[PDB]
DNA sequence: CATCAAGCCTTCCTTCAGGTGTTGCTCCAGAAAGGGTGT
DNA sequence: ACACCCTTTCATTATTAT
């Protein structure tokens, strides 16, 4: 239907790439081996075809949140938001392999090879949740395609197309950000600090003598793991434009309109990852719904049909549909 | 052979979600409610044909102009 | 006739391929065994001979779109937005047998040989869609060829050709994207979390519980039931980039022309090759030369305009019974 | 609840930020080498997205602390000053293993790959301090997101959604200042200095004559010269501190520890005060709550918190820090 | 109202922390043959 | 009454490179 919404993280973000990624402590991504290294989690970048001086297209990084993240993040707001209050308000409930199926798509591992119903298929993509996310332990293909979420920026620029030429980032994106995670009881330092501690002075100093022997074991490594863990993790820097292509094909109006409810409920979500850290913290300042500008700060404030369609079909949710998604047919 | 023989993968599916959408609509008239993909019109088949990059030479007696024009369409 | 579709990835391409792939925590793509490998599904490579930096040709891996999926997409938007609308327009149904024929070029509806007349061949090989691809029981060979989606890079060069130096990408077009299934029972986290499930905490404990005897079972078995926890790969082709595509009509008439181009007009809101979950394949088109001449415009294609007559006349002329003749008899 | 802490720094923030980062005798940083080049620790800076011509935007660097610092600031301030003497007055007693997984997140560096049956995850998370601050051995997610103290500043316009459209300092917020250690047994003077170590005079002589030696050619002197980087004082900051789906009795038990936030130094610098601050303002989900004895209003949050420190007791800390 | 000094020195970093767990795929790519039943 | 459809049903090996 072709949604494009664009936020603003006001707080970094954080998808961990996975990876074994090491740093200096001046800041050199992946030193040679020799030097001092620390541990790095960088975030998760894409490679993207850009224009770099002129027809000099190149596969340049671009640092970004991956579409299944961003997918599991509209999933769980819609259900959190719209799909779980619409369900307990009335005595609605789901079995903890339709819990299972509605969150991570299927029920378990091991799916049936044996295909569902026709009439089945059809109302599952008629529902206003499952043919969205069409899982299940008989895939369903669910009609919502979500994009990876795209820094507004010169190396996206191929792929943003046109309209997007202000407000428009260039150059570095990221940053490196260190954490010290430093022992506790080495901020001990009175007897009055001391006195929630079973034995007082004396298990502090148990384990002073266990950390120096750890110390010694370590060195004698060199030339169990205790709580000191000083590392690096890079993310994105704040402030950035993104954007968040949104998409559904051929969908019903209550299935646009369930998304419309999570895009208006996306306050107060997490983009991936860092939780202690705020990270994912965001602000969308726009929604275009197939080309025109539907967000205002209070809200959507446009596309009303889509909205009384939901409306009306989590009037009429229910658990039937969940569980015969759920059910396997070998189970 | 200027190339490592290789081996092409293709597949041969109907598309179920679609069938499904044309069945609810009726411009599909299946009375059946349940595809198959071991056989039947909704069969996803798997094969694997192989490929090779080469030079291809043909020895012959003909007529080279004749030749040329067919070979050149 | 040749069309030349250059196309425009926005986002990455995913035309998945067989064969057990692994890869490590790091980007180690199949990784001697004795250490901890992953499954990867890479995008869909080919072998092709290129001839860059030398004059000889060496084989190096061209990461592209099967001309079978791209035939298939075809075929699909041309259903979906030509031929379905207006056969509904009309009011006309299809068999089984008349749609595994039209949507999948299968011989389900007579299985066994059907004999097709020489002048039945010429007249269903004039049709606009018949004639494209054939396929059924008489298995038709049709007007149509389409090419595989070709990246405009240097491995790419033997199959361009000249006129692509420009906007030639070079090295790695792929990428290792991770994805995990997390298991949403082990992100319960309060009673108002729970108590939409059945049971509530006493099932999700028994889920909990049930986890660990499948950790604990599966540790001892390394030293079947499988869980919703998983985390795997994928190789993507990079979005941003630039692909050409060849479509070949072999003598066609004017209205098979307009079909193809009716497709290219309504492909925009089609994908390449699947990924659909993750939004994988959509593009915009950024040129479509017809016989060299460049017709794309940025508003669907402008000119060609006996193209689009020709098509206009056939599917206001299109029924079902030729697709019912072309299937059963 | 989303929580606005507006704070002002009273003395420079210093938190320092990893690098091998130089000053010479003028404030060029990082210079080339062959100059005078005395070691800098800077602060810590965030790049973050601001136009920099108005119609641009592009990273600009802003000295912020981080929200690990924050976080566990607030989480030493409010288990410091609450929950252990809620602990010794009614006699709990954590084990070390249960101390350290109250202020860092576990007791070991290893957390066991094991998932955690969900009554222990809902009595975790409906506690207060666990709530809040998750980890352990089975690494539990807590309820309280803490965001990086920003100085309310026009490169972070893109930061501050709304509120400060007039209160934004504009301009460079931080000040390299010097630092140097003299050895002191070269500023005696008096043979009635020399009268409390032992050996005397000439002992302190010996000493002298190693630093001619360390004038002549590991061993390092105690005659120092430094410099750090800090952020000027009397900037005003911003402090987000967030809550995913609360019970009521972490509200106030984040409310307590805002309340008594004003004996303690924001992490860094300690022996020059760095870290003095005082708060001008707390918003609880957009309404100013605080006054100048501190927080007034919330009344439901302080209440359900005091209940909580009643039946505060060291077994659930025990079961949450006790590994799988 | 003009020079006349119009710096000298020496400091010019110190210590650890320098990850940990887990994921480590799932399934299907048959087609009679014997029963139904629906036009 | 025959084409369309829904269930059994039966066949045998075997290692793996990148």
Redesign the interface.
């Known amino acids: 239907m072709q949604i494009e919404v664009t936020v603003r993280n006001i707080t970094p973000i954080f998808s961990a790439a996975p990876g074994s990624n090491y740093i200096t402590i001046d800041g050199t991504i992946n030193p040679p081996p020799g030097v001092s290294r620390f541990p790095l989690v960088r975030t998760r970048m894409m490679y993207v075809a850009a224009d770099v001086g002129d027809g000099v297209i190149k596969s340049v990084p671009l640092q970004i949140v991956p579409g299944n993240t961003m997918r599991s993040l509209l999933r769980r707001t819609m259900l959190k938001h719209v799909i779980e209050p619409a369900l307990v308000e009335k005595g609605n409930k789901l079995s903890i392999g339709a819990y299972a199926t509605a969150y991570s798509g299927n029920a378990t591992g091991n799916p049936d090879g044996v295909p569902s119903s026709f009439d089945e298929i059809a109302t599952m993509r008629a529902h206003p949740f499952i043919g969205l996310f069409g899982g299940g332990p008989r895939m369903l293909e669910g009609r919502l395609m979500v994009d990876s979420l795209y820094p507004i920026h010169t190396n996206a620029e191929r792929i943003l197309g046109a309209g997007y030429e202000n407000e428009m980032m260039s150059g570095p994106i990221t940053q490196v950000v260190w954490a010290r995670r430093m022992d506790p009881i080495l901020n001990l330092g009175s007897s009055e600090d001391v006195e929630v501690i079973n034995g007082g002075a004396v298990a502090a100093n148990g384990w002073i003598q266990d950390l120096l022997a750890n110390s010694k074991a370590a060195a004698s490594k060199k030339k169990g793991r205790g709580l000191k863990a000083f590392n690096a993790h890079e993310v994105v820097i704040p402030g950035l434009k993104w954007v968040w292509r949104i998409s559904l094909d051929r969908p019903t109006d209550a299935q646009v309109g369930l998304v419309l409810l999570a895009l208006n409920k996306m306050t107060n979500e997490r983009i991936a990852g860092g939780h202690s850290k705020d990270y994912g913290r965001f602000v969308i300042d726009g929604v275009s719904l197939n080309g025109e500008q539907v967000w205002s700060q209070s809200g959507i404030t446009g596309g009303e049909q889509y909205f009384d369609a939901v409306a009306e079909a989590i009037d009429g949710l229910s658990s039937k549909e969940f569980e015969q998604f759920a059910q396997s047919a070998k189970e | 052979r200027?190339?490592?023989n290789?081996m092409?993968?293709?597949?041969?599916?109907?598309?179920?979600?679609?069938?499904?959408?044309?069945?609810?609509?009726?411009?599909?008239?299946?009375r059946?409610?349940?595809?198959?993909?071991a056989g039947?019109?909704?069969?996803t088949s798997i094969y694997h044909r192989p490929?090779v990059?080469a030079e291809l030479t043909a020895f012959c007696v003909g007529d080279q102009q004749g030749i040329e024009a067919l070979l050149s369409e």
């Open positions: 200027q190339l490592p290789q092409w993968m293709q597949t041969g599916r109907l598309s179920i979600v679609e069938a499904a959408r044309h069945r609810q609509s009726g411009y599909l008239q299946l059946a409610g349940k595809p198959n993909p039947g019109p909704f069969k490929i990059q």
